[PDB]
Amino acid sequence: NHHVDYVIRFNYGDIDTPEAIKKFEVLLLELSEVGLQTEVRQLFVFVRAASKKKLKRAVYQSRVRDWLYGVRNTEPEPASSAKPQSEAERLLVIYHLITVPKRHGEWKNVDAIFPLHDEETNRQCMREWSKKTFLSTEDLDRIRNTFGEHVGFYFAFLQSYFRFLMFPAAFGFSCWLFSIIYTVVNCLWCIVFIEYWKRQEEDLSCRWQTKGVSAVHEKRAEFKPEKEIVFPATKRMYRQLLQVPFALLAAVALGAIIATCFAIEIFISEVYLKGYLVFIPTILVSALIPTMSAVLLTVATKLNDYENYETQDAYKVALTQKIFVVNFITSYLPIILTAFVYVPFASRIVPYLDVNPDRLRKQVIYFTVTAQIVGFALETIVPFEARFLTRVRNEAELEDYDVTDDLREMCIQFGYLALFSPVWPLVPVSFLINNWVELRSDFFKICVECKRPWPQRADTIGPWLDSLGFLSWVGSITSSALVYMFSNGPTTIRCWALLLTIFFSEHLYLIVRYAVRSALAKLEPPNTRRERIERFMMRKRYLDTVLSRFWMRQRGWKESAEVGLSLITKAKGD
Amino acid sequence: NHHVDYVIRFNYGDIDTPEAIKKFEVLLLELSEVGLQTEVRQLFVFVRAASKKKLKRAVYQSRVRDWLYGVRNTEPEPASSAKPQSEAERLLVIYHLITVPKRHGEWKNVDAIFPLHDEETNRQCMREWSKKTFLSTEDLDRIRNTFGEHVGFYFAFLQSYFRFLMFPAAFGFSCWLFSIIYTVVNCLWCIVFIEYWKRQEEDLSCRWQTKGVSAVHEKRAEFKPEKEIVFPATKRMYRQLLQVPFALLAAVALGAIIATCFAIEIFISEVYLKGYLVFIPTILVSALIPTMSAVLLTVATKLNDYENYETQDAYKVALTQKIFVVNFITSYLPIILTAFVYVPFASRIVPYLDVNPDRLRKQVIYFTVTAQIVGFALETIVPFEARFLTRVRNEAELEDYDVTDDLREMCIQFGYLALFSPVWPLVPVSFLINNWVELRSDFFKICVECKRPWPQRADTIGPWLDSLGFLSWVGSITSSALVYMFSNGPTTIRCWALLLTIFFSEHLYLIVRYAVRSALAKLEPPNTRRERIERFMMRKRYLDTVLSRFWMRQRGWKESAEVGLSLITKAKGD
Known part of the structure; x- marks a missing residue:
């Protein structure tokens, strides 16, 4: 100190x-x-x-x-x-x-x-929290008053997401354990959460002292000396023209890898006690994916560094777009691919793959639980004069912190929960147990496994909220496709009713989006506080300021009163 | 004076x-x-x-x-x-x-x-304008400086709409006179106009002295004495529950009327020199509709008066919603009804209507030109002491002005132009000739056929811009349905490819909407003026304000310079 x-x-x-x-x-x-x-x-x-x-x-x-x-x-x-x-x-x-x-x-x-760290109060809020698993408002402001309120927005978002995830946990364990009623309640949860977080964010920003910050910083990397202080907006288009085909090539490569996995699955199931040993390559590639996510993540980081897309702020928006498309392709191309291709088109494709129905419900289980199983069992297969200057040299010899990685992982959680929950409704209890364990891990790794961040001033949690909304929308379309497509098992496809279901369900999603947003716009937060204070200052200043042609031969008060009296008597003389 | x-x-x-x-x-x-x-x-x-x-x-x-x-x-x-x-x-x-x-x-x-009227300058800008048909910016500000800038926003909107309507006039006469290329260029025009008017409105508001006005007036009609100054928000739901079924009943009644018209059309064409005399009941009901529009308009006015929906501002938004749904049903239920019902389903319905293909291209002509023909030929079949107090008693014995009616009629123009232009691409030249005639009629009827309005302070032209956008969107879907549906005439419907065309074309509309809006957000207006002025005041105030533990035994400048010199020499002693 x-x-x-x-x-x-x-x-x-x-x-x-x-x-x-x-x-x-x-x-x-x-x-x-x-x-x-x-x-x-x-x-x-x-x-x-x-x-x-x-x-x-x-x-x-x-x-x-x-x-x-x-x-x-x-x-x-x-x-x-x-x-x-x-x-x-x-x-x-x-x-x-x-x-x-x-x-x-x-x-x-x-x-x-x-x-440097306030290791006293840091340790107090470390070992204050083996308890109650729901960080109350005063302790949340304690998290604000050290390392900024940007980190406060992050932790409030994560805790609110836990609080709303525990309802589809109870409901998805309460599917007497695929029906259409669970799809409807899934999309309703999925859209209530985003609109509730919008109004909660607007409340909690004004409760702290950031009404809205748009002060554009100038990250001094971009460079084109042209005029008095300038880069022309043309090379942006050339480098977005670089952005698109590499993402398409990444999609093609992932499709080739997963097709190799399905062909090997077919070969093993044809040659051969060992059903899990049949299904192993799906498990292996599912565990192998979250490394490839970080590989393509640093690739896209180099691409956005090559682009100097903004000076500072829309650099973050461009980076969130790169992370979203990379993350989306590398974690949702396999399920969409295997469902929408290999389930209706089996007998027309597996003769090409040489020298089955309801694979999907096992595909999704392996593909959404495997990474958690590896990351959870790793922590078990591993066990079984100047005198505070040394502390400073501990603190400097330490890595830096980024909020983005854990929030990316949360967006993955949300995408599997929204894009296709009803295939296997134990997805919410799995995710609930995962972040139930990883809560204190997140707070520990931000408090002592890294140095302090300098306190930023951010209002929003970034473009992740818009990517959340877009992902909910796509999830509405895809859920409406699946639950019609595989209900009740000599079957038929009936390609108008499926496409009608897609169309009609998407527009029902959109009208419920508008209705719930206009409903919660009416239901106010406790922002009545910090708006009523503005009302009092308003009214106080107003009441301060309310203090301190040859023919106009007629007088204002008395002459006009007598004249009007004469006129109405003259009128009512009939 | x-x-x-x-x-x-x-x-x-x-x-x-x-x-x-x-x-x-x-x-x-x-x-x-x-x-x-x-x-x-x-x-x-x-x-x-x-x-x-x-x-x-x-x-x-x-x-x-x-x-x-x-x-x-x-x-x-x-x-x-x-x-x-x-x-x-x-x-x-x-x-x-x-x-x-x-x-x-x-x-x-x-x-x-x-x-009272400034009849001198009023007459100057009356008889200044038998010329050039494009009111320049100085004369536009002359229109601002009398009777407010709300009326200025109205006239600037109408003139800008004329300026962008004259391009589909040339193009729709240049359809070598239904093909898909005209549908694409129609939707592109239709969306460019709305986004261009958004940025033009944001420019022109800041060019005058209204950055944005949201001062809620309190129209003293609503009444519920409950607390210190309150009406509960519950009876709003009861009266919207009144709003919906009456609109549905109006749709049913209009459908019954137009079905009676088609049955009479069938009877005359079966019994019987006289082809127009066959098609007369469509013409009669088309001329009869614009009276029914005002009838249901005052009905919906009474409904919104019954609802006291806001004190003042969202009263206007609710009224624009009522006018839009009434106007939409009473001017677009006939064409949508006759196309999407009587063209594919003829032989299954006309046996029920007892005791034809490409009707539609004649239906739309009659139904969009008839009202203009009647309103244009009416003006031909009709011909062939106190001393200025009398002027004041002329001015008081005079009707009041509403902006809404002419702007409603413009929204009708836009809806026929957007919802189905390629049926008959002489719709834009017809509309161009109509407002080509009615321009000076509008300015005359606002200047001497009514008293002055008191100068309002409005920023936007109201909810008509959002209703314009929504109408463009629905027009995208319906145009994409029609032009696939009737192209190349033993035919087939092929009910997946039509619905695929609906889906795919709607989402292509939405992505072009996002792309053009983010493009024109980059292309700045001459708001650089009234933002650079704010920049100078900003910088001026900043440059004003930039003017006018027992161990700290080490000195700031010289000791630290000598110590750092000693340290780097000590480090580079190897």
């Missing part, structure tokens, strides 16, 4: 002639901005606030930056002598004082700069 | 005992708010601004009301001694000073209050 706000590491990289100049320049710009540049430690350096008036000036800088771009409607007009938040406002002000333009040499000569 | 801002009429209605008291109360509240209450005329009364400082106070009241609810980001802080607009700002301030709460007895004892 040495009152150190950030550390800044430096790498002494090549030979030591210019580093004195560059270190002096870093220190120069630093002391121009932030005093009490501490280097009692060694390579790295420390910072903290110089004087409380200077801290007050930097706070007022940040407040003017906030009101200048839209957040916090009221102006910051006084020298605002109020006590800040716990550490969120303080660390955010200091990070903005280091990061913003008008601040580091060679643009990446220094490596990552980071605060 | 007697500097009179508004007149206020009074009706002396029943017998004359309380009217002295009520007139004195009206005059009392008036002189408390607005002096120079002039009644040199008689029943009615005049008003004008009392003193220029008092006018300045009322202006500052209005400015605080504007900045208090969001419009005009900057505060109105000084005693703003600036000259106003021509008459728009002035009349709006005075009308708000009369109308707002914290102002008329019995809530409707006085009748309508209204400004």
